[PDB]
Amino acid sequence: VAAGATLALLSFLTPLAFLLLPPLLWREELEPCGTACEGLFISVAFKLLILLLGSWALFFRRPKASLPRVFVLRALLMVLVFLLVVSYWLFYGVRILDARERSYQGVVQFAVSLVDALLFVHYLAVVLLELRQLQPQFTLKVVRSTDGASRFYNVGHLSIQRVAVWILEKYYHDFPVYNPALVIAAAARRRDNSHNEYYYEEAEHERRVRKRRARLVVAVEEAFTHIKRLVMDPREAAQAIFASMARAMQKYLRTTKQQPYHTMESILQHLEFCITHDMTPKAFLERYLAAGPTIQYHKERWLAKQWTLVSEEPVTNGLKDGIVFLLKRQDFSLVVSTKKVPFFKLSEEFVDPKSHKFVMRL
Amino acid sequence: VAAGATLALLSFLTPLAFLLLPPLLWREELEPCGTACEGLFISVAFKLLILLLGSWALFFRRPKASLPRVFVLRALLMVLVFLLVVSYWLFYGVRILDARERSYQGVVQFAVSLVDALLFVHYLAVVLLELRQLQPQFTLKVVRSTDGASRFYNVGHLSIQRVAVWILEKYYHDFPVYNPALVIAAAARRRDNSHNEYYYEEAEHERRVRKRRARLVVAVEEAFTHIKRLVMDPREAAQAIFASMARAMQKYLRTTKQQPYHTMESILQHLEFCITHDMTPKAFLERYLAAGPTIQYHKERWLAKQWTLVSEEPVTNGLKDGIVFLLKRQDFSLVVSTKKVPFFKLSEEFVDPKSHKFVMRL
Amino acid sequence: VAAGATLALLSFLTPLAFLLLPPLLWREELEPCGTACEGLFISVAFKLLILLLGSWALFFRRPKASLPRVFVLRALLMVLVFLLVVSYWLFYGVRILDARERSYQGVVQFAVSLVDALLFVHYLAVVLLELRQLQPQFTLKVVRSTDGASRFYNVGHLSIQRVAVWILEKYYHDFPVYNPALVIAAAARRRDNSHNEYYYEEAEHERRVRKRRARLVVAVEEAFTHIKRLVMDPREAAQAIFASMARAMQKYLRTTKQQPYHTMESILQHLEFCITHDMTPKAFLERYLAAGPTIQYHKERWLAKQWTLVSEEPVTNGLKDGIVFLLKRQDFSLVVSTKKVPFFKLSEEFVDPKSHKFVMRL
């Protein structure tokens, strides 16, 4: 960041320094030039403005993740910007500044080429960091090692660590939140021929969950009917309608193992939120009936600063068919399996929309 | 649009005017130049062609939405194009046109710098309007205020109104279609200790929906068996097989509260569509068994021109953690809650794929 | 590819040839020039480096699909690169090479304009091939003609064949894998008034599937408890724990019609995979309990080289509202229906967050 910000500042200041050093250090010795110089000054002004606006739009933002190894392409871009600026300064010093270049059109064109090169480096930074991974090259199966919640994704050419950050950005809203509260063949044959206890326990659990869900739906409908939109603030109204639903809410959160996700304070805040935004009882209960993804919950359950990238291959090398890597937290892990999206061979077949003719039997 | 199209036309015509005014108004007074002029003419030709092709590809398309406030970045881009063109014209007039610039190489280089600056403005327009929001910065919980249908999305740096249009583009194919047809603690305790009427009503409704679904599946299988692919048109065949399924279809649409979504005319059109495209009875019933999203239905149920953006913050300012805003229609509303995607700190751990060694017990 | 690679190589070599032919064929006749030449050499060096890096990042990759007709925009780009290079060579030959141009600054500026034009052609290639379809213009309903598995997508301005490849890239991880093993009004009335055989058969099938699923969950829990992480390799451990679950796995794959998807060898490989990556019994069974998408399976079931694009309209023309086309394989087909994303008219409404005041009754 500090090095990157310094490189950006020096890159933006370099054309202006190139254009100001001759008119300041040697103005009389400098050879006067016509209108091409001023036209190039205007072009430099607008191209520096374009460069600053684009840099703000894409690159004046905080790093979104702390990668385990160096950001390979962004390091290459910093090196390229640095080599460009340093080489331009070297040449400028040794052949313009030292020689006290009388031809000012040459210096102005050198600064113009610098600004063009910086806009092209910005374009290259966009191509490397944003566009190389638009075309989906690979499909990733991401599975939690505990409950098997699986999603498949398409991803372009990213390094394994950038792919890891990408999958983490997807995880906090795609998978449900992690709820930890949720001879040999002869032994298998003896088990299979026993009472199917798990089947009936699962059926009973689903039945009691449906019963508690019904109780909760009725309780929340009654609770929201206990107030009118129209004196009383939305917080006071949430607190007044929470009493007629606190027991059913608590019992449903207990039967579905959702106690630590939803405190009384968070449920009151969400009641206030809903009744403020005209949300019906069902738009209130959508948060509590289903498991819901990780970002939906409190920030102390995210623990985004505690991801470990376990990769058999070095993480700076991009994906290829078969790369498996783990994203481990303290409790679960995300197993990511890579499969290259297969080569497609489309053929074109033409059918006449009038050629569809049908008959009675079968 | 009109102002934007005028700016685009003037920007494309400005280099050509710069290159044609000297050879027309003062050709004898103009100083002849060598081959660099013609090389720059060829470069201007190909760069104007590139500019026109890119403008067609991205910016010669109709506005996709009517935002409540000004499009901030596109207004900035129009202002930038206008300032660039107007300043180039001012300088050209006062130092080339008025002075009758004899050096034609300078004028050609000025036009070249203009074309470069327009290509760079096009690049900046792409960066501002398309690329600033590629990197997912925020996660949006979008919930219908009526039935609680919720989806989470990742979105980059967009203003709240552009985020609203984005969420609307997502809504018509993500959420199911809106079907409107679908002391105090002592009172809550008395209710919870009563007959769980909602549970048994829900079970009975699901049972009768499954029964009507089974009747409909059988009816549609029989109906499609009542015709063969092979005289009779697909429309006549749809009308001939609709009789053997009209009652079951109507009864299933009534039990699932889907009467106004599917008219006899639309069902006949979809029968014709399916039997034209070799779609099986199940590929036919996929439209009718599930609720389905909004765009699947008739255009009079979209009402895309009737969205209201209710935001506590001004809608030209981009998203930040905690921005809640409503997208209200006549009936329901989309509550959108923003949460910044958290900062990730990946660590790298290496495991030896050969180091996995297991033992018998537990 | 061969023509494209040749065009790329010639385009990269053309500036260097332009800069080397005068200093080699006529060095004495060549007019010496100052430092502007060397500054432009450095700019050419860094801009050719930028061009090569961007071309590698985006365009040095194998074609991802075999389209039925010509890639219209990529053909336009090849034609544009070719016309640019050929016209630059024509002018260079006839006015620099033949005339033995003494002014070397002109030749260097011509090469600089060439490199700028190639970077701008690269930018135009990005705009045409990657950016024109970022803005979602259309919504596509993709439905399998057999089981009606449907997904809606947003897609920008792509041709119908590029849209087809896009939908295929989505299909192998979005839809479940294709499992083929899964007067007239008076006749309809007689059928509807008969025993609802399909309802009870469906209920019985779901019940026995739940029973086999419970047996399989218990069997896999026991199997994974039959080993400890800690001598025995993960393959030997998978083979040792497969015996206590092989029967339940086979019976569940038979009741859900999943025999050909999962061989004993693939199940052993996946057991080894899971027990290697600390995946619990449920993270193991996530692959077998649900249908799962196509890419999850063996590569002989993908058959990506056997897609047929059946389109009523020519496939080189982009999408518009109402374009329906088929993606046919040997067994099923993907019906794709296009609907233009509707024009949105947002309005802004302001509500005071303090103005929310509620009252007791109803």
Joined tokens for residue C150: 């449907």
d(CA B3, CA A19): 35
Computed on alpha carbons and rounded to an integer, the radius of gyration of chain C in Å comes to: 32
**Residue numbers of C between 247 and 286 with CB closer than 8 Å to B:** 275-276
Q: Are A106 and C39 in contact (CB < 8 Å)?
A: yes
| Maximum pairwise Cα distance, chain C | 104
- A128 at B interface, C-beta within 8 A: no
User: Which string of DSSP letters, residue by residue, matches C71-113?
Assistant: -HHHHHHHHHHHHHHHHHHHHHIIIIITTT--BHHHHHHHHHH
Q: Are A215 and B234 in contact (CB < 8 Å)?
A: no
Structural contact between residues B166 and B158, judged by C-beta atoms closer than 8 angstroms: yes
Mutation target to probe the B interface, by most B beta carbons within 10 A, among C344, C349, C355 is: C344
DSSP A128: I
**Residues in chain B closer than 8 A to A287 (CB atoms):** 148, 150
Distances from the Cα of B358 to the Cα of C140, C229, C230, C272, angstroms: 49, 5, 5, 11
Residue whose C-alpha is closest to residue A135's, from C62, C157, C154 = C62
Helix (H, G, I), strand (E, B) or coil at C315: coil
Give the one of C120, C145, C230 whose C-beta lies nearest to B50's C-beta: C120
**Distance in Å, alpha carbon of B337 to nearest chain C alpha carbon:** 15
- C128 at A interface, C-beta within 8 A: no
Resolution (A): 2.9
User: CA B108, B112, B113: angle at the middle one, nearest 5?
Assistant: 120
Sheet holding C307-311, edge to edge: C65-66, A344-349, C307-311, C324-328, C333-340, C138-144, C150-155
**Residues in chain A closer than 8 A to C306 (CB atoms):** 345
User: Which string of DSSP letters, residue by residue, matches A135-200?
Assistant: S--EEEEEEETTT--EEEEEE-S-BHHHHHHHHHHHHHHHSBP--TT--HHHHHHHHHTS--HHHH
d(CA B302, CA B292): 13
**Distance in Å, alpha carbon of C287 to nearest chain B alpha carbon:** 22
Q: Are B341 and A172 in contact (CB < 8 Å)?
A: yes
Per DSSP, helices labelled H in C175-263 are 184-192, 197-225, 234-242, 246-255
Provide CB contacts within 8 A for A35, sequence distance 6+: B91, B95, B96, B99, B101, B103, B106, B110
Joined tokens for residue B241: 């097989």
| Pairing verdict, β B138-144 and B333-340 | antiparallel
Q: What is the distance in angstroms between the CA of the first residue and the CA of the last residue of chain C?
A: 71
Return the partners of chain A (3 or more C-beta pairs < 8 Å): B, C
d(CA B191, CA B187): 6
| Pairing verdict, β A138-144 and A333-340 | antiparallel
d(CA C214, CA C220): 10
Phi, psi values for residue B178, rounded to 5°: -70, 115
Distance of CA A264 to the CA centre of its chain: 31
Structural contact between residues A355 and A204, judged by C-beta atoms closer than 8 angstroms: no
Give the one of B68, B215, B361 whose C-beta lies nearest to C348's C-beta: B68
- B310 at C interface, C-beta within 8 A: yes
Computed on alpha carbons and rounded to an integer, the radius of gyration of chain A in Å comes to: 32
DSSP C69: S
Joined tokens for residue B343: 């900062």
**Distance in Å, alpha carbon of C128 to nearest chain B alpha carbon:** 6
Phi, psi values for residue B337, rounded to 5°: -110, 130
Structural contact between residues B173 and B294, judged by C-beta atoms closer than 8 angstroms: yes
- Length of chain A in terms of residues written: 362
Which chain C residue shows the shortest CA-CA distance from A99? C35
d(CA A64, CA C209): 45
Using the structure block, give the residue that is written with the tokens 């040749």.
Answer: C6
DSSP A256: T
Structural contact between residues A82 and A146, judged by C-beta atoms closer than 8 angstroms: no
H or E element that contains A25: helix A2-25
Joined tokens for residue C46: 């860094």
Based on the number of CB atoms within 10 Å of its own CB, is A221 exposed (0-12), middle (13-18) or buried (19 or more)?
Answer: middle
Residue type, C81: V
Structural contact between residues C286 and A149, judged by C-beta atoms closer than 8 angstroms: yes
Provide CB contacts within 8 A for C175, sequence distance 6+: C142, C144, C149, C151, C293, C294
**Residues in chain A closer than 8 A to C360 (CB atoms):** 226-228, 232
Q: Are C169 and A127 in contact (CB < 8 Å)?
A: no
**Residues in chain C closer than 8 A to A153 (CB atoms):** 173
Joined tokens for residue C53: 């890096």
3-state SS, one letter per residue, for chain B: CHHHHHHHHHHHHHHHHHHHHHHHHCCCCCECCCHHHHHHHHHHHHHHHHHHHHHHHHHCCCCCEECCCCCHHHHHHHHHHHHHHHHHHHHHHHHHHCCCCCEHHHHHHHHHHHHHHHHHHHHHHHHHHHHCCCCCCEEEEEEECCCCCEEEEEECCCEHHHHHHHHHHHHHHHCECCCCCCCHHHHHHHHHCCCCHHHHHHHHHHHHHHHHHHHHHHHHHHHHHCCECCCCCHHHHHHHHHCCCHHHHHHHHHHCCCCCCCCHHHHHHHHHHHHHCCCCHHHHHHHHHCCCEHHHCCHHHCCCCCEEEEECCCCCCECCCCCEEEEECCCCEEEEEEEECCCEEEEEECCCCCCCCCECCC
Structural contact between residues C229 and C274, judged by C-beta atoms closer than 8 angstroms: no
- C135 at B interface, C-beta within 8 A: yes
Residue A205 burial (CB count, 10 A) = 12
| Pairing verdict, β B344-349 and A65-66 | parallel
